[PDB]
Amino acid sequence: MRKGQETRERVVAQAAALFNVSGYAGTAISDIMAATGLEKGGIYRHFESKEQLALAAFDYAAEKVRERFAVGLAGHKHTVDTIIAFLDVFRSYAERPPLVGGCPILNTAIESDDTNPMLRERVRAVIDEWRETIRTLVQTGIARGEIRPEVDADRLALLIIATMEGAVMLARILETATPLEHAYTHLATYITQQVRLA
Amino acid sequence: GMRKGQETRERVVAQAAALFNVSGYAGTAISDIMAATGLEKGGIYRHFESKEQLALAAFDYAAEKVRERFAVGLAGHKHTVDTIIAFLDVFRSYAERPPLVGGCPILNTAIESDDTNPMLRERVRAVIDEWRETIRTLVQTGIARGEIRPEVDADRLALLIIATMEGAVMLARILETATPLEHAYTHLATYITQQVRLA
Numbered sequence: 001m002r003k004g005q006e007t008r009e010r011v012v013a014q015a016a017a018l019f020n021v022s023g024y025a026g027t028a029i030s031d032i033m034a035a036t037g038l039e040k041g042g043i044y045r046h047f048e049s050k051e052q053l054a055l056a057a058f059d060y061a062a063e064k065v066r067e068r069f070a071v072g073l074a075g076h077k078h079t080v081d082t083i084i085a086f087l088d089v090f091r092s093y094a095e096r097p098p099l100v101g102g103c104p105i106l107n108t109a110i111e112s113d114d115t116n117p118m119l120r121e122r123v124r125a126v127i128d129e130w131r132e133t134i135r136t137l138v139q140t141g142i143a144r145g146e147i148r149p150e151v152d153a154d155r156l157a158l159l160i161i162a163t164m165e166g167a168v169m170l171a172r173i174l175e176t177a178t179p180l181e182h183a184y185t186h187l188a189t190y191i192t193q194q195v196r197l198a
Numbered sequence: 199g200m201r202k203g204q205e206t207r208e209r210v211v212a213q214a215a216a217l218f219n220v221s222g223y224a225g226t227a228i229s230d231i232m233a234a235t236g237l238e239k240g241g242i243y244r245h246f247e248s249k250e251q252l253a254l255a256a257f258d259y260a261a262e263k264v265r266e267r268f269a270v271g272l273a274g275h276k277h278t279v280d281t282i283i284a285f286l287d288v289f290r291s292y293a294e295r296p297p298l299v300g301g302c303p304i305l306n307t308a309i310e311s312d313d314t315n316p317m318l319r320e321r322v323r324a325v326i327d328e329w330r331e332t333i334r335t336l337v338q339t340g341i342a343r344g345e346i347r348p349e350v351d352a353d354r355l356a357l358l359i360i361a362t363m364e365g366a367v368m369l370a371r372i373l374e375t376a377t378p379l380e381h382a383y384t385h386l387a388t389y390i391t392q393q394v395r396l397a
């Protein structure tokens with residue numbers, strides 16, 4: 001049972017890394033078979049299909065993202081500092097993405113938006129976790145006098161997500177961290193100047 | 199004739215581009231390109247040596263289309279800030295009318311090519327560098343005219359604008375709502391008008 005659970009874990013883990021780089025359609029099952037020692041058969045002992053593996057792999061990738069944000073946001077007391085910590089998680093993707101190939105939420109978004117309802121919904125669910133996190137921080141901050149009462153929480157969330165993800169895209173194309181540094185500095189300054197209260 | 203061949207190539211490249219924009223390069227099979235062009239495989243590869251060369255030509259086509267769209271969007275403004283905000287407005291207009299079916303081909307090709315294909319990556323980078331040069335030229339013009347604060351870092355602004363607007367294109371498509379593009383536009387237009395514009 002342990003062998004099974006660990007072999008499933010290495011299959012999903014390696015699948016997620018390869019999918020994150022070449023996409024679902026462009027990652028050949030044979031290469032995942034190759035990357036897991038299953039070149040002579042047996043990947044279907046753990047998954048019914050490549051599509052089921054894709055969903056499991058995305059869930060794995062989403063868990064890594066979730067862990068990166070949970071660690072990044074822990075320990076801050078002031079709600080604005082916590083929101084800035086959220087920016088810093090994305091900032092750190094320039095050289096340290098959640099897994100090889102960059103942000104799997106951004107990567108899967110581009111592939112699935114016009115091709116795959118189930119992956120679309122899984123991407124949207126993660127985006128919605130992020131919106132909920134920011135909404136809750138803004139609400140608590142407003143209540144504590146740390147954030148201005150007029151701040152539109154979801155508008156702020158959508159701006160942060162768009163800016164940081166677009167910068168993640170740019171940083172891997174331009175092969176430099178500078179877009180992420182600039183996007184971070186812009187939003188941190190904006191937040192401190194226009195969102196923060198005390 | 200050679201004229202007919204040049205036209206046939208144009209048609210194939212245009213159809214390939216639309217398919218690749220949706221399903222990607224690896225996910226678009228030659229049989230899909232056949233169906234969309236009404237051509238047999240041999241009819242396509244008479245004009246292209248390979249799927250790879252076709253993919254490159256299809257991107258160059260997508261790049262030119264994006265270029266035309268910015269060209270019309272940016273033409274004729276009387277103030278450099280108006281011109282920079284019109285660059286945002288081009289992206290905002292993607293909400294209902296992307297440059298081609300399936301969204302921004304620069305964004306879409308970036309995500310696929312960045313860790314897979316040096317030649318497409320270089321082409322994507324060249325497009326991003328054109329946008330950066332456009333915005334830098336406008337910023338230096340505006341500074342010369344007293345329209346833009348001299349302290350404005352042009353390339354910092356360019357990369358912020360591109361990151362924001364492209365991230366919003368991604369979000370608007372995945373959330374199935376224009377709202378992220380509208381918010382991004384408003385945020386940047388307001389920021390530029392309040393902090394970049396001098397007079």
Ligand SMILES: [Mg+2]
Pocket residue numbers: 109110111112113114219220300301306
């Ligand atoms: Mg797409």
Ligand SMILES: [Mg+2]
Pocket residue numbers: 020021101102107308309310311312313
């Ligand atoms: Mg990629």
